[PDB]
Design a protein around this ligand. Structure first.
Ligand code: ATP
Ligand code: ATP
Ligand code: TTP
Ligand code: MG
Ligand code: MG
Ligand code: MN
Ligand code: MN
Ligand code: MN
Ligand code: MN
Lengths: 289, 683, 683, 289
């Protein structure tokens, strides 16, 4: 009911890194404090590392196990965007803002970081556990994928959106907004594929899959809180970032056809500023009674 | 989760294969012994409570000053002597969430059900302690329910207006359009739903002073009204709701309908303004004969004849319009337009359908004006005269803009108490009081029509509840016989009360002398046809009550001829959406949508069974979607023959049926005399 | 392709490495030999032409009846004796496509240039044949050009109003908002551009009748106004144009600005509503010192102080607002807000910038009111008083809504005729006549302010054309010296004519006694500083014309003290969009955007070189984008020191410069005394 | 030395079939004989099948086994083109020219056609035989992919090109030329990767790999001859098409670094004719003049 519509929306959102000139960001970058520059670098590396997993494994593995030519094509298109567009875009932002040696060090740090690794390996673990012709294991991986696309990225997206909403780092913020817009549709699409599997299950199996999804969400959420404090306490933003994580967790759940887990909260306004019945002809004698 | 929430959810947990309906009662107890009694604000006596509510700008002191405190205490004691108990959790929840008065911070409950009823009764009586006690007994017995505006806002300082619906006539001018937008914003600020007749506005491609193809049509005015209703949204609490009505012979009728198509562009789509279509008998005749019809440009007709297209009878002037070369018209297929109406109603439930000839063949005030459109709920059908809002520093010709006060009889409680007459008369008095104390300072035509017409709307609720709790199928002929007798009694006693008020005040409504009430024509079918029950079961249901005969109707006709009628319009059956919960009643005279409804509040879910639902009456509580819409049309026509205004008739459709079935239902409704059709809700 | 279009496109074809500018002249001949004369309706005599135009509802009978036919014939003969020839094809094309009177079928030409000029002169003179001949000589010499409304509609029965700039004050009420929407619709119907001040409106999240978080802010009002302007679009001829002005200290200022962002949603963005921001000196001081600023909730300030936030001086009120706990405010970064303004102007050219203190430190009528906002073109700067539009059947308190009368001097034609005094005085008389003959029956405050203030706007155009044809660079100090002298003489003769009219009629403008004209303060800089040219070239340019000295200014000051001044405002420099083509002039006092402009009409291409452009003056006709914006600001400030109202000042930016450069230009404009900044056009 | 330039070339060649309006072919299509229309539909259906498997299976699987994020990005992009662009374009052509029943019938015909099933079996079999870290199985699949890109498509491409060259079906022909332009660069790129693996081998191993490549080519060739006769005999063109496929077989071999195998022949000359603004913060010195 939905693949051709998503095909259309995906291909019409096509874009390339070269379209946004990045050099003018140096005019606001130079005015940020060390903690702001440090947080930005670390967040950016976090997003880059997670998105690489999605391009190399997450999207291609789902495309491999999903049946249907049109679904495989949409999934291929999404994998292409991860590897050919998003990955080059993140690299471009880095090369503009930091010298080569600084980039290498930030990636070394984030590669060793406990909270980034915990979530990266949890997601990758579920992708590696998919078994041929087993729709339960595929569903679990789809849940992991939706959580990455619609939830885990957002502790990171917060900061570029925060600057973007203030008039700072506008070129890289525009790029991030385009990336985020792609991840949103990726999350919704994979969510619909997961619901299709979920709806084929018994009531007991459904309850079991719901417990899986909520348990996974809880593990990731508790690690996100730690990840958040680790990066954002030094710039005083953690309270507001936490509200943004929960709001996006609820969107991820709704993508999977589940109820929201967290109470509704308002979001930081700066970040917000950054963000047929069958026709049957009348046959006459229908006017007479 | 709260204890009462768990007890209410325990209903669906079946025990021995049966629903645990009694658990619902337990929930109410919990809801009172854990939330309401703890969150209520108690005073040492009633004096301290009244003083606190008066000085803190919760209550108007004027209506309370008409009684000595002893009389107010007696009224409150009469209210509390009944020991009223909410039989379902949802009734109490809905009252204490939507209608009970709370503090400024909404942390505590200041008004109980008895307190609210006492305040409303004291406002109604206007200084009469015995009348206040009568109103208290009428409302605590739940025989009569004032509308949501009246029940919620009576006697409150921070209140809005007590009138629920307003109907505006928009003349074909920029000054009139701007005044209509202003009045719509003012009345939505007051909280009332506003309906506007756009049939007088000239269509798209008409001339504004000799420059042709200049008008934006009714769609531009529709966009303006939609933005006005979006802006005036009851201070952001309830979304601003407006209705636009267009005659089906208007040239813009397609574009009008295109405002509700799900594929409409943003420059055409209108989303907060309901749409209604007024269909004369000429359109149905043309569609029946498959003859191609003609939609007309209103301004050309006004230029040629001096009157608006909707100001005269299309059944007699359509051929003159078509044969007149000075009248501009476009060819349409009436059957294709009917199919478009059915498709639109299937997709979105719009437009409202108003069968103009069905309304005006029994309309008692055709001399004042024909009914050209309906309200936002498509049940108010009254004469309206358009206003001529002129330029600044020029006097405006103020017309009549429809406005009536709503109030519903609880059929189950009225018939259980065997008090059709007393309840009808007291409800008529309360609605007359609500009309008299209504004064709107920013809608001149509405104010003038309220002062002159004195129109009120006395509805009814719990028809299906009464029928199912008495072992009568809603589609059965016995149910239609009961509706015929009950609503003939309601009409008889409403006319009697209106004539008695006219006698006691020495005044009738404006232009009553030309009405069918004055000439005696209105009583024709009542002085020749007997409306006593034809079935023994219904007659037993009406035992202990004097069913009016043709002789009583003749006496009432003579009484009206001698004294006149105070109200131009008396009976209109509103949907009664949320106040039906508090009364433990089914919504309006419509059949129930579902036996048990699951509603999500906050993060919790609640189940409301239909009032009186049980094992023995499970199948008598037949869901509306499972019912034959033709028999529902028969019921609504049977009720409508005794209602001077319309009835909010919602169609309940299944997904399997086609637009042809919807068109057949609409045409059967038109054939059976249905005045208006409210909604096409698809399961 | 028509022959004249080929002759016009032959300009770009270079012969001997030079543009064939003279070929344009040939095109004009073709445009008259092939098209204009063939499609021009000719009559046996002028009597037959006038009878046909009056009878067929082309002209008005009233203004022609004031003259005998001999006088009208003499005026027409005076117009035709000049043997005026359009020097460029685009001049004649623009006149005969936009201003020449055509038949109802729009295929024949009823009015030539001389006919239109004679009709406008006869309308101006109001019965004086000699005055009509003076006006004819003024307009056929092309020294003065009435604005597009006046030039197009004067003497025509089928016409809009002669005023097209309207400024409305909107009070903080639903009645006032609805009245503002109505007045905007009525004035757009008349063909005028409407500017509304939204600073008095309370921000989003304010209280309505002591219920919190109820107001939608100024953005909902902007949505309503945008819908009203879309609906009222000159009977479907031009897109409805409106402007909204908000003070930068209003809390909605961001959301206001957010209405122009491309990323804004459909419920946020307004497309046909221009926006302008009023920036007091306090905001610039806060941004300069990098101190965090506060945007205030207007209703809290009104409740605390009894006056609106925009009605008091923010320079002395800002600290009291910040230190007042009962005034609600939000923290903002003024430098971030300035960067947002620059970014928005780069993206879309919005908002217009009004430097409130720059306007009000030289405003002569601060006693009546301080200038709180500007017009749709950001050049009208006048005192306005808000109106209190109450409920129905209640008397409104009518204030002052600005509506000035436009007309432009052609600096080249005026100075080559050595007729600054005569042209200025005759233009002032014509503007006074048009202001007196304007009667708007749907805008009460506009009509009251037109009757009381008698404000007119006398502009100038062809400044860059005159400077380039005289070998003077627009950015040169000699150009600024010429502008200083020329506009000081314009101000001198405008004040002299206003005082002479006041003496003749015996009346001044309302509240003139409190103005700086009455106290003599206005003339201070004129009785102490000599504005004679400091360069010999400019003095030789002014040869043959008496340049008012300090003694002449003292005499004028004494004359104004004795007799008063008839006009509250006299001079405002409008953009002069299409009339600059007909007059073969550069637009306003702005520098030219392109030396030769390429336009597409129908499916044909056309080429308009700037007037007088040749090989010798190609370098002096420097394009605006290539110019230093600081020197353009200097010239505009030099002119503004002699203009009581503002100047439509468009910034011309290259795509290379960033928002820092735009902010620097804005801050230098604020420093140099620039009152308004119109547009940021990026090449 | 080459991936970056292939990346740039691939992304700059990006297109969608919707860019080309197809209603202009309606009349030249109507005018073809029933035999011609039948061959044309079947030819494009055979192409659709090849691109379906190249997009679903071939390109993603090669991407999985090739090392390097940039090489993977190119291969992922090529995969997307196969199924999201190329395979879909054929349906755009079918939906314009043919009624639904004829479309349904031709897709049923691909399922039961023995030559088309054989070629799919052979090519996809080799893709699915790739073993992780086994460069020889990867080489074999890359040879198969080059043979699909640069040889097997051409029995199909002949006919749209043959019409394009006569000024017939030129909108459909424009789509086909864009597809062909893509496959030419895809065949070169995969060829270069195959040569990398081949060049690592001993002389003895190389000799075996040449045997594999030539044996596979001959086996595919013999099947393609029968397929060509089956499709083209009814339009009289089989011998001409055979010359064309031999020509392209030589190009495939060359893409693999091997000598041409078939002798040069004259190809039909008709077919040859068928071929925001930058933002700076405000300094304190910008407020003073
Ligand atoms: N269903 C209900 N509807 C309305 N009020 C209720 C309901 N249940 C409890 N209450 C309120 O909570 C109180 C709790 O008392 P409850 O009904 O348990 O009996 P009680 O203490 O014996 O006294 P009584 O029934 O005479 O009021 C009631 O007195 C009443 O005020
Ligand atoms: N450049 C122009 N601007 C305006 N009108 C023009 C122009 N060129 C020609 N015309 C119109 O065409 C007429 C013919 O002018 P032309 O150049 O042929 O010679 P003329 O001596 O001016 O003619 P006439 O006897 O009409 O005065 C003019 O009278 C005028 O009405
Ligand atoms: C002014 C205006 C009117 N209209 C339409 C809507 C009104 O119903 C209709 C009447 O406008 P009027 O206000 O009546 O205009 P008018 O009185 O000057 O013209 P006339 O003498 O012909 O009545 O014109 C538009 O559609 N757009 C507009 O901008
Ligand atoms: Mg009118
Ligand atoms: Mg107010
Ligand atoms: Mn990505
Ligand atoms: Mn993604
Ligand atoms: Mn391909
Ligand atoms: Mn390929």
């Amino acid at each position: 009911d939905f693949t051709q519509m998503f095909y259309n929306q995906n291909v019409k959102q096509f874009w390339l890194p070269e379209e946004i000139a990045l050099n003018g960001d140096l005019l606001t970058w130079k005015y940020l404090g060390k903690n702001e520059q440090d947080t930005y670098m670390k967040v950016l590396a976090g997003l880059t590392l997670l998105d690489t997993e999605q391009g190399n494994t997450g999207m291609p593995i789902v495309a491999e196990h999903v049946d249907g030519h049109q679904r495989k094509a949409v999934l291929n298109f999404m994998a292409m965007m991860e590897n050919a567009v998003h990955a080059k875009s993140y690299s471009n932002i880095f090369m503009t803002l930091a010298p080569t040696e600084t980039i290498n060090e930030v990636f070394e740090w984030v590669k060793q970081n406990k909270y980034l690794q915990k979530k990266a390996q949890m997601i990758v673990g579920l992708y590696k556990a998919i078994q041929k012709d087993d729709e339960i294991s595929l569903f679990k991986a789809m849940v992991a994928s939706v959580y990455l696309e619609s939830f885990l990225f957002y502790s990171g997206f917060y900061y570029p959106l925060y600057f973007y909403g203030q008039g700072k780092l506008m070129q890289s913020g525009e790029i991030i907004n385009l990336i985020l817009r792609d991840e949103a549709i990726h999350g919704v699409y994979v969510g619909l594929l997961a619901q299709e599997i979920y709806n084929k299950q018994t009531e007991e199996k459904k309850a079991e899959l719901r417990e899986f999804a909520i348990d996974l969400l809880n593990q990731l959420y508790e690690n996100e809180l730690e990840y958040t404090e680790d990066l954002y306490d030094q710039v005083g933003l953690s309270h507001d970032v936490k509200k943004f994580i929960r709001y996006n967790a609820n969107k991820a759940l709704m993508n999977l056809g589940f109820d929201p887990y967290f109470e509704e909260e308002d979001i930081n306004p700066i970040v917000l500023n950054g963000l047929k019945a069958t026709v049957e002809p009348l046959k006459d004698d229908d006017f007479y009674f | 989760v709260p204890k009462w929430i768990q007890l209410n959810n325990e209903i669906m947990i079946q025990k021995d294969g049966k629903f645990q309906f009694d658990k619902d009662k337990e929930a109410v107890h919990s809801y009172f012994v854990d939330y309401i009694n703890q969150n209520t604000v108690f005073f040492h006596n009633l004096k301290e409570k009244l003083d606190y509510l008066v000085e803190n700008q919760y209550y108007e002191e004027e209506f309370l000053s008409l009684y000595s405190f002893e009389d107010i205490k007696e009224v409150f004691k009469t209210a509390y002597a009944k020991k009223f108990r909410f039989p379902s959790f949802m009734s109490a929840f809905k009252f204490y969430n939507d209608y009970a008065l709370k503090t400024n911070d909404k942390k505590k409950i200041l008004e109980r059900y008895e307190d609210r009823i006492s305040i409303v009764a004291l406002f109604f009586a206007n200084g009469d302690t015995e009348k206040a006690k009568e109103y208290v007994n009428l409302m605590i017995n739940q025989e009569y329910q004032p509308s949501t505006p009246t029940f919620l806002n009576a006697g409150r300082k921070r209140r809005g207006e007590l009138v629920s619906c307003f109907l505006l006539e928009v003349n074909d001018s920029l000054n009139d359009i701007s005044r209509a937008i202003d009045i719509s914003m003012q009345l939505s600020k007051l909280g009332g739903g506003v309906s506007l007749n756009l049939s007088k506005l000239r269509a798209k491609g008409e001339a504004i002073k000799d420059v042709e193809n200049a008008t934006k049509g009714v769609v531009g005015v529709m966009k303006l009204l939609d933005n006005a209703f979006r802006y005036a949204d009851q201070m952001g609490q309830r979304q601003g709701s407006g209705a636009a009505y267009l005659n089906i012979f208007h040239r813009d009728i397609n574009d009008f309908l295109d405002t509700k198509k799900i594929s409409a562009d943003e420059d055409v789509r209108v989303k907060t303004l309901s749409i209604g279509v007024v269909i004369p008998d000429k359109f149905v005749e043309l569609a029946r004969e498959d003859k191609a019809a003609y939609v007309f440009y209103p301004h050309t007709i006004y230029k040629e004849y001096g009157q608006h297209m909707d100001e005269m009878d299309m059944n007699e002037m359509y051929d003159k319009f078509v044969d007149n070369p000075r009248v501009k018209k476009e060819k349409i297929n009436p059957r294709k337009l009917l199919e478009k109406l059915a498709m639109l109603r299937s997709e979105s439930g719009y437009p409202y359908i108003m069968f103009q000839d069905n309304v005006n063949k029994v309309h008692a005030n055709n001399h004042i004006s024909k009914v050209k459109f309906s309200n936002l709920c498509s049940e108010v059908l009254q004469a309206s005269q358009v206003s001529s809002y002129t330029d600044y520093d020029e006097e405006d010709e103020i017309g009549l803009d429809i406005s009536c006060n709503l109030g519903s009889l609880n059929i189950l409680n009225v018939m259980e108490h065997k008090s059709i007459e007393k309840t009808v008369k007291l409800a008529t008095d309360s609605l007359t009081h609500v009309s008299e104390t209504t004064d709107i300072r920013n809608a001149p035509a509405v104010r003038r029509a309220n002062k002159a017409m004195k129109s009120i709307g006395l509805g009814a609720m719990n028809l299906h509840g009464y029928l199912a709790q008495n072992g009568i199928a809603y589609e059965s002929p016995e149910a239609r016989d009961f509706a015929n007798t009950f609503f003939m009694m309601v009409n008889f006693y409403s006319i009697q009360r209106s004539a008695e008020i006219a006698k006691e005040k020495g005044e009738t409504f404006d232009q009553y002398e030309g009405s069918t009430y004055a000439t005696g024509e209105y009583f024709d079918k009542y002085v020749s046809t007997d409306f006593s029950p034809k079935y023994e079961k219904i007659a037993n249901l009406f035992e202990g009550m004097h069913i009016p005969t043709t002789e009583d109707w003749k006496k009432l006709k003579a009484f009206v001829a001698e004294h006149g009628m105070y109200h131009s319009y008396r009976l209109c059956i509103a949907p009664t959406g949320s106040i039906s919960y508090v009364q433990s009643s089914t919504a309006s005279v419509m059949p129930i949508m579902e036996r048990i409804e699951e509603r999500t509040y906050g993060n919790s879910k609640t189940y409301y069974p239909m009032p009186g639902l049980a094992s023995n009456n499970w199948f008598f509580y037949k869901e509306a979607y499972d019912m034959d819409m033709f028999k529902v049309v028969d019921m609504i026509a049977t009720i409508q023959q005794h209602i001077d205004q319309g009835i909010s008739f919602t169609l309940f459709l299944k997904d399997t049926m086609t637009t042809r079935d919807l068109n057949r239902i609409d045409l059967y409704a038109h054939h059976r005399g249905i005045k208006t059709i409210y909604y096409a809700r698809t399961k």
